[PDB]
């Protein structure tokens, strides 16, 4: 699996593969990684379990009207509960969530990173991608969307785990 | 073991073999792994002990009585406290679950399949059938009953841990 | 350890051999395997710790006068409380019981077997046991206690974990 | 350590080394393994912590206190809770307790052992008693005490985590 | 990572690198490991989670607001907890502190250590630090700023987890 | 570490060495590993994490006033609570305490050893410290603190993981 996410001029973006794999096979290949949350204002994308991905998101928009939409804020909230609460505990899963002032990841190890450009690369694939990414994101004029796109492609070519079954949320504030 | 369920001509079934083994030896030849459900409405199949299905199996019901018929609901409230209530959650088992409407698998993790083309194999055998079933789904007329069939037969023929004895469980609509 | 039991004509029985083994060294000859339960209505085997035995046999016997003697019924709830329950999740044991309705299999996992003709063989010797069970069930006209010890011995012969020593419930249905 | 445990011509008796050991080297050399209990009526040996025993000890007489005299069935509630209660499960070692009723070994399984002829030997050295024990036993008029005795530094000779240090707990009745 | 406090001409400091590891690859490279607390008096690095900070910094805060600026308490007091509070226990990190009395480092052991010079070096690349800041501050007349740079520098130079991206934190009183 | 006790006319003492080592480098040398408990009647040494002493320590005292000082018997109940209870269950840690009737370890393992001379080693440079007290305290008149001072740095010489820093606490009877 590989979660990518971009941002350009008020464009922010985040792209997934689809494939679910078990030991050495496909599972499934049209996996729903990314999904949006929160009145439609906050787009995210998750490595692991669809279930463990959906509780961690459902508390996470809990925790987002409980903190009048401060991503951060909101976020580092959930990056407690996750770590401290017994059942979430037990979750495995990788967040990566966007809204129009920041991007960032969210791990059970109550750590909330917010890469360099809001550059966001995480799963199997993660490497890849960021490596794909950030050369398309300074060599090139081309647009999050674009980018995500084009490095997502390129971490499922490299990346044994990862896909050509994609699913974008963009969201443009500009 | 191997649980094959396909789709075609509003007809949809569920079958499996009957081998149940301990290390490298077949403890018993003959086990059911697909029953039905919910007034004979509601077809599954399954892979685990012969009591977490009867408990998974009567949960079920129970939630689809409390979800008029629709299926997926009820499989996503039971998938939920399949992860969720301390005791449910030592359950180990992948329940394939089949209505006139869809079909999916259910994992301990509560996650909640619904794969490619309704077409199911879980289970040592299950990508073997699936291969089978995939070919014949694609190059033939045959009937969805004679798909599961078929290929649990490739399946058993292949999985050391599959068998031939099966237990098929049909469904027309139309 | 092996627990054996066969059933022929209104006659059941349930042999076990008498050796615990620590390590590499045997450190009792003669445990009795074997015990009768429910007012000598139903006959059991064990693989593994006596006092786990007991605790979990006295619990079975507590859900039969609890179901009016219905043995799977009776047996399928022990299969519960064994996997769900805190203290009894931990026990390690095997459960061989028989009453005149039918023989089975009951072990942590929330499993409840019932192999091809009550025929049941556990323990490390178990399949040994199984092996000419069979044979001689299917070409002789033996009885259940002949074919039972029979049968053990040639486990003793074979698994080194079963012994010589012998204890046999016998229930008469006829 | 070696615990060995006799019972001949209305005598019974206990013996046992002193060595602890820690990785590759002696600890102690005249640890205390073979006290007294039930106002000096019984006889013990152990192995395990100095203080496990005094607690798994003093149990015992209470429990001795609660079936007058009856040694077989204190020692049956004993090794009940020693398995059941939450606290007292973590306490490890191997209880040796004789009377001039009979005599047996509980380990923290919650079982309650009678050998063979109340000849007991429990530890490292265990089984290299048992067989001098045996041996003497079966081919010479000696006493009880001189059996253990002998047993015992055969086992310390043998047995790198036994010493020559002993505690002998004798018994007479008739 | 690598923390780097050093403590001379009433002058203490504490820099930091900011690169955050996953694997073989670099996360993030600008991660701010040394912040500051205490109505800015009171110094500090770490390494660990974000969050893991952010919680165990702002208790340490009110810690020192319950023992009026006296450090070492707060931090003794801090320190307890941390190792006690069934939550707080699972945070994971190495709290670096110092006040113009002195500085110490905090484990989840509950441990308060102070380093013979108030010189501390945690993080992978903690002892290459440990070695230049101890050369310069035994053979040069440097400045514990200028110190804990140049020690950070040869960190980031030998240690394959620690880069060139500081953050300096000092604090004068004389 | 090392933790050496030695006991001559009148006079006991505990010295340790100061070490503290992470993986091969080590973290602080000059660790506090003795100290005075129970208004000073009472001495004690420990290998291992200096919190969780801490935390033991403390409650040996509080063993202390509640038994009139004996030694022995609050030291039992210490090796109860440490190895019953959740929390202290969890501490890691070896004790050496004495006074003027005898000296003796204490382990979560509940084990309360008095070895042969009050003759105290502990630590992984346990032995060879033991090894040099014993050839002293048997070929020369020397007094305790001689003799576990000079131990003590034997082992530091031998023991890898002991420097030679020392800190003695020494108890006066006579």
Request: hydrophobic residues 45%.
């Amino acid at each position: 699996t590989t979660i990518v996410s971009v941002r350009r001029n008020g464009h922010v973006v985040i792209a997934g593969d689809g494939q679910a794999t078990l030991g050495n096979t496909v599972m499934k290949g049209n996996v729903k990684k990314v999904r949006r949350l929160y009145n439609d204002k906050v787009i995210a994308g998750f490595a692991g379990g669809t279930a463990d991905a959906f509780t961690l998101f459902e508390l996470f928009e809990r925790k987002l009207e409980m903190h009048q939409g401060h991503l951060v804020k909101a976020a580092v909230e959930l990056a407690k509960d996750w770590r401290t609460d017994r059942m979430l505990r037990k979750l495995e899963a990788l967040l990566a969530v966007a809204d129009e002032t920041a991007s960032l990841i969210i791990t059970g190890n109550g750590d909330v990173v917010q890469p360099e450009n809001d550059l966001i690369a995480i799963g199997s694939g993660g490497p890849y991608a960021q490596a794909a990414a950030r050369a398309l994101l300074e060599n090139t004029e081309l647009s999050a969307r674009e980018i995500a796109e084009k490095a997502l492609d390129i971490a499922g070519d490299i990346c044994i785990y990862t896909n050509h079954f994609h699913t974008i949320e963009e969201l443009s504030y500009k």
